């Protein structure tokens, strides 16, 4: 067809080098960080990864910000529904808006 701009760049001595980490390696790192955060909490970032149930981890997180942990255990399904709805709104916004 027609001459590309990248070919005209390459013919004049300009070269683009590939990065050391491929996208699969970045995805593996992100998945490892996500699994360590979900299963262990913050324990995996300061030593060995110690398992904890996720409801108890979220009770720990509420106890961090000054709310007593019975608030989560009495409103667990509502907070789960709010989190799922917020992830759904992020998915809808990323499917709709591109700015």
């Amino acid at each position: 067809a027609a001459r590309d701009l990248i070919c005209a760049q390459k013919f004049n001595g300009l070269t683009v080098l590939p990065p050391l980490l491929t996208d699969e390696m970045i995805a593996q790192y992100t998945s490892a960080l996500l699994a360590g955060t979900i299963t262990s909490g913050w324990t995996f970032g300061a030593g060995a990864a110690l398992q904890i149930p996720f409801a108890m981890q979220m009770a720990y997180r509420f106890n961090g910000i000054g709310v007593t942990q019975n608030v989560l255990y009495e409103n667990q399904k509502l907070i789960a529904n709010q989190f799922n709805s917020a992830i759904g709104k992020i998915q809808d916004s990323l499917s709709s808006t591109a700015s």
Binding site: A46, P53, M56, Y73, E74
Partner: protein, 105 residues
């Protein structure tokens, strides 16, 4: 200030720079335990004040989060909120009351 739970730091001089000696806390020897979010006693839900409910094969204890120091579940280290029909994963156990043996004796 380093990797782990930070405790102290010491500065040292270097040519065109500085060197920090970060002292940290790293947990070492973990152990598997069975846990519950609450203790149902006399129709009331008991939540720990600070720490976590753990269990060996027979008994239930309360211990702090970063070190295994099990203690007898008592009304001093637990607080009451609601009943047992709401919390998911509640278990049945007894809670010690220190006033009853002092009043009886």
């Amino acid at each position: 200030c380093g990797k782990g739970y930070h405790l102290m730091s010491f500065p040292q001089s270097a040519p065109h720079g500085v060197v920090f000696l970060h002292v940290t806390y790293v947990p070492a020897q973990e152990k598997n335990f069975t846990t519950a979010p609450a203790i149902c006693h006399d129709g009331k839900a008991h939540f720990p004040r600070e720490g976590v409910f753990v269990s060996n094969g027979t008994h239930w204890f309360v211990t702090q989060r970063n070190f295994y120091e099990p203690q007898i579940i008592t009304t001093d280290n637990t607080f009451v909120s609601g009943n047992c029909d709401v919390v998911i994963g509640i278990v049945n156990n007894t809670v010690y009351d220190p006033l009853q043996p002092e009043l009886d004796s």
